[PDB]
Amino acid sequence: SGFRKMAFPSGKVEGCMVQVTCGTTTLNGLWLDDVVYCPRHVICTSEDMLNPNYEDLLIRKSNHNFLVQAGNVQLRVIGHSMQNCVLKLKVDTANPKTPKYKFVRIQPGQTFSVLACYNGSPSGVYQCAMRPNFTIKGSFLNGSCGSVGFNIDYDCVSFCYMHHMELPTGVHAGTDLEGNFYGPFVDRQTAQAAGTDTTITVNVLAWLYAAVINGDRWFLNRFTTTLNDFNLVAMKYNYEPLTQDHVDILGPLSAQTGIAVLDMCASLKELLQNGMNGRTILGSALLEDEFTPFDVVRQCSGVTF
Amino acid sequence: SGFRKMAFPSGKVEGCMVQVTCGTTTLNGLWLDDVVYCPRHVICTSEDMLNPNYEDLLIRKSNHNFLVQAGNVQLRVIGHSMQNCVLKLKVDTANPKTPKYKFVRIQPGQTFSVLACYNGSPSGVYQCAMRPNFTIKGSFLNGSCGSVGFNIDYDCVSFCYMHHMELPTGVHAGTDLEGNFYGPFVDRQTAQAAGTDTTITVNVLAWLYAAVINGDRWFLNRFTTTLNDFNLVAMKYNYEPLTQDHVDILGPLSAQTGIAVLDMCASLKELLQNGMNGRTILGSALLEDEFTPFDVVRQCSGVTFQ
Numbered sequence: 001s002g003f004r005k006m007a008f009p010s011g012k013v014e015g016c017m018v019q020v021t022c023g024t025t026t027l028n029g030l031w032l033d034d035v036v037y038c039p040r041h042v043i044c045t046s047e048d049m050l051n052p053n054y055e056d057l058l059i060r061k062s063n064h065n066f067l068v069q070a071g072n073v074q075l076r077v078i079g080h081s082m083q084n085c086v087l088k089l090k091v092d093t094a095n096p097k098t099p100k101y102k103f104v105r106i107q108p109g110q111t112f113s114v115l116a117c118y119n120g121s122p123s124g125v126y127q128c129a130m131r132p133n134f135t136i137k138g139s140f141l142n143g144s145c146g147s148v149g150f151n152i153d154y155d156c157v158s159f160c161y162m163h164h165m166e167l168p169t170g171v172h173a174g175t176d177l178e179g180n181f182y183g184p185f186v187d188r189q190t191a192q193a194a195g196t197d198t199t200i201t202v203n204v205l206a207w208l209y210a211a212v213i214n215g216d217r218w219f220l221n222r223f224t225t226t227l228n229d230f231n232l233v234a235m236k237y238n239y240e241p242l243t244q245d246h247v248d249i250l251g252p253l254s255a256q257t258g259i260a261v262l263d264m265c266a267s268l269k270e271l272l273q274n275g276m277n278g279r280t281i282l283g284s285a286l287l288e289d290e291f292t293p294f295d296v297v298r299q300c301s302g303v304t305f
Numbered sequence: 306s307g308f309r310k311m312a313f314p315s316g317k318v319e320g321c322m323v324q325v326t327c328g329t330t331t332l333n334g335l336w337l338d339d340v341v342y343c344p345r346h347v348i349c350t351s352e353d354m355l356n357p358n359y360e361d362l363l364i365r366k367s368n369h370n371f372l373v374q375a376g377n378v379q380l381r382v383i384g385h386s387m388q389n390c391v392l393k394l395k396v397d398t399a400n401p402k403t404p405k406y407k408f409v410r411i412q413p414g415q416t417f418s419v420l421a422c423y424n425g426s427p428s429g430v431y432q433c434a435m436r437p438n439f440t441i442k443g444s445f446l447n448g449s450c451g452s453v454g455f456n457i458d459y460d461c462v463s464f465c466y467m468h469h470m471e472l473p474t475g476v477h478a479g480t481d482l483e484g485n486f487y488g489p490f491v492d493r494q495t496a497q498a499a500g501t502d503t504t505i506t507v508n509v510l511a512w513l514y515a516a517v518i519n520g521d522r523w524f525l526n527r528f529t530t531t532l533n534d535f536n537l538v539a540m541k542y543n544y545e546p547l548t549q550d551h552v553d554i555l556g557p558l559s560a561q562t563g564i565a566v567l568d569m570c571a572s573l574k575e576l577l578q579n580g581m582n583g584r585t586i587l588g589s590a591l592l593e594d595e596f597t598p599f600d601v602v603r604q605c606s607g608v609t610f611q
């Protein structure tokens with residue numbers, strides 16, 4: 001028993017982190033097979049970042065302008081190119097610690113583990129969700145660019161996030177590992193802002209199921225509702241709409257607990273309309289929305305990697 | 306910017322986790338150099354859980370009664386001994402992945418990362434704190450015994466917790482890596498209950514300092530307090546007493562923010578009186594107490610957002 005915000009074990013990813021230095025800029029890179037991946041803004045001076053022409057800036061660079069350090073070993077760069085907003089540095093040695101991996105692009109509401117890194121050295125791990133407004137509420141300081149987010153499935157690491165920028169509200173923006181930004185952001189030092197965010201409804205429901213599994217059930221009630229009626233309530237309280245796909249996805253938890261999704265939706269409606277009566281759920285006084293249905297099943301069943 | 310429950314990267318500990326089996330009982334062990342550490346209740350049977358005599362149970366075992374599996378490799382046990390509530394199995398192979406490490410016994414209020422493991426394989430990593438009542442609020446299923454807690458300040462793993470038991474309220478009890486339990490607990494299934502818990506006051510103050518560092522001051526006020534008056538109020542809300550040691554430990558955060566420690570105590574007193582009035586602090590609607598002053602300095606910028 002117990003229920004914690006839980007990250008994947010990070011060892012498979014720690015062996016892939018390297019330091020990338022270009023001129024006076026140092027940040028992190030991801031070393032897989034014989035390529036190191038990092039943000040393309042590594043090649044910009046601070047004045048460059050105000051309005052960069054990345055193709056033109058990269059022409060001035062040669063392989064020896066990129067200093068790549070894996071632990072205490074220098075890696076030899078033998079090629080360089082861009083894919084969208086990521087720089088790809090070909091090196092002369094394949095990473096012997098490359099795990100089974102793939103590159104995936106996630107959707108808002110999905111969660112992942114972040115390995116925060118500085119100067120190529122892993123410093124912390126925590127769990128994040130891709131927000132509906134395509135930001136993540138991470139914890140990053142200067143030097144953290146190039147830190148990555150990932151999920152693990154059996155033996156395969158699925159990389160889904162590379163860190164690029166901090167926005168003025170203190171939330172974070174980045175790309176998938178093919179260099180495509182999440183959200184309407186660009187890698188330029190210019191006026192940009194997170195849009196208004198919403199609450200991830202299917203995840204709040206998943207966490208209520210986790211609460212019931214862990215013996216917290218004061219919010220259950222005799223009522224049920226319909227998808228159409230509930231979605232009017234969700235809209236009023238700035239929650240994402242609930243689809244039939246979400247109901248089906250909550251299947252395994254609705255089986256493990258034996259409570260119907262629209263049954264639980266009636267509980268959530270009452271919590272939205274009335275609040276918590278000075279009570280808590282799983283140690284929180286807020287409705288938590290960064291646990292997916294799969295996260296709840298994963299933690300309550302003890303899956304290993 | 307940002308503030309999360311941040312664990313240490315777990316890879317250095319993942320490389321030490323093994324599976325230990327004695328009889329029908331399987332749990333996790335920690336393989337450092339040529340020794341595997343695990344809870345001694347691996348040698349109990351279901352029948353004898355209320356009052357096991359561990360000395361008598363162990364003398365009946367030979368080395369080959371312990372099966373130790375590291376990945377898909379069986380390790381050969383060549384010796385065994387008991388230290389307090391931990392079994393130490395000598396094996397004929399030193400772990401080539403042994404990190405730099407030490408063993409430390411921690412005080413209540415200290416935090417650490419937990420690598421939850423089943424059958425010698427890691428499941429996930431999260432942050433915990435040693436509660437004032439010497440339990441931890443973990444997330445552990447059957448088979449998790451022998452999972453460990455640790456910090457990795459600098460390049461060295463300090464192991465501070467090994468998981469032994471789940472208590473009836475759903476919280477967890479265990480030992481340091483010398484086998485000494487935290488708190489009054491014993492490794493048998495006789496009736497045991499966690500004592501009344503309290504809130505870790507010095508950690509709440511550290512987390513309020515983190516909030517200021519990250520740019521929020523709405524909860525401050527114009528008042529101060531004596532240390533004794535603060536403790537008289539705070540204890541009425543089930544908070545632990547704040548000592549001069551705690552005031553000293555908060556010094557660096559006080560210096561970075563320009564908020565005297567006893568002025569932050571006055572803010573906390575008012576927060577306990579008023580609640581948050583629909584606001585949040587660092588994403589929470591409750592006063593959080595599982596970040597230490599050291600944790601805040603580790604995670605936060607050295608430059609306050611003024």
Ligand SMILES: N#Cc1ccccc1-c1cc(-c2cc(Cl)cc(OCC3CC3)c2)c(=O)n(-c2cccnc2)c1
Pocket residue numbers: 025026027041049140141142143144145146164165166167168186187188189190191192306
């Ligand atoms: N690492 C690193 C690093 C090393 C050398 C030089 C710079 C950086 C760097 C750059 C950015 C950045 C980059 C671009 Cl292209 C645009 C941009 O615009 C912000 C404004 C639109 C809102 C910001 C950034 O955000 N950080 C940073 C700081 C703290 C936490 N997370 C990221 C660090």
Ligand SMILES: N#Cc1ccccc1-c1cc(-c2cc(Cl)cc(OCC3CC3)c2)c(=O)n(-c2cccnc2)c1
Pocket residue numbers: 001330331332346445446447448449450451469470471472473491492493494495496497
């Ligand atoms: N692993 C494993 C394992 C493998 C084979 C057989 C048993 C166990 C086992 C044993 C205990 C335990 C052991 C002793 Cl000696 C006393 C005790 O007393 C509880 C009551 C006094 C309060 C409990 C335990 O708590 N768990 C367990 C379960 C869920 C989460 N965390 C731990 C798992």
